[PDB]
């Protein structure tokens, strides 16, 4: 209902955890579990590539279509570009529907 492609078996969840490394155990044995651990974190890179299948426009329309454009008028910033403080901001939501087909 929100949008997208419903699937019985969507792409699976990737769960990640950094394994616990405990601090020094006491010398005398204790039944209880170890609640003292080393403060720790991890870092890396993810690559996600998707292969998409396209359906090309076959339209026999005469007059020109509507398209999505960046309006030319001058502005303090560039849309879909970084700020002066280094902040990336998307100005407006972009739908998928511009080209037309016959009903």
């Amino acid at each position: 209902l929100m949008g997208g492609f419903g699937m019985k078996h969507p792409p699976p969840q990737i769960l990640i955890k950094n394994t616990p490394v405990p601090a020094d155990p006491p010398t005398a044995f204790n039944k209880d579990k170890l609640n003292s651990f080393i403060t720790q974190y991890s870092t890396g890179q993810v690559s996600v590539e998707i292969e998409w299948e396209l359906q090309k426009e076959n339209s026999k329309r005469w007059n020109p279509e509507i398209q999505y454009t960046s309006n030319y008028y001058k502005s303090n910033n560039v849309e879909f570009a970084v700020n002066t403080e280094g902040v990336y901001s998307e100005p407006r939501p972009i739908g998928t529907r511009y080209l037309t087909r016959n009903l």
Binding site: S59, R61, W62, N63, P64, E65, Q67
Partner: protein, 104 residues
Amino acid sequence: DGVGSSSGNWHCDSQWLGDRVITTSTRTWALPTYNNHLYKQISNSTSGGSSNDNAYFGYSTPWGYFDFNRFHCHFSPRDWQRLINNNWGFRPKRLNFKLFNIQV
């Protein structure tokens, strides 16, 4: 061939391949008789032409010609939009011309 068989079909489509476009067009034309089958030596002195910058001399012929070399002849406004939005450059490669279904 014959009177009752058509000389050629109407083919107006345009096909977009990856690196290449082929735009076919078909029109209907009408050719009159020009200058009563004469060559008339047109010049400025025929009508007016009182300025030297406008002086000219030439000949007018009964013949007539096909000029298709504007762009709107070969492209629809949609095929032009598809062209200029998706592409950095272009240039023509081949040309093919046909006259058919002549009637006098």
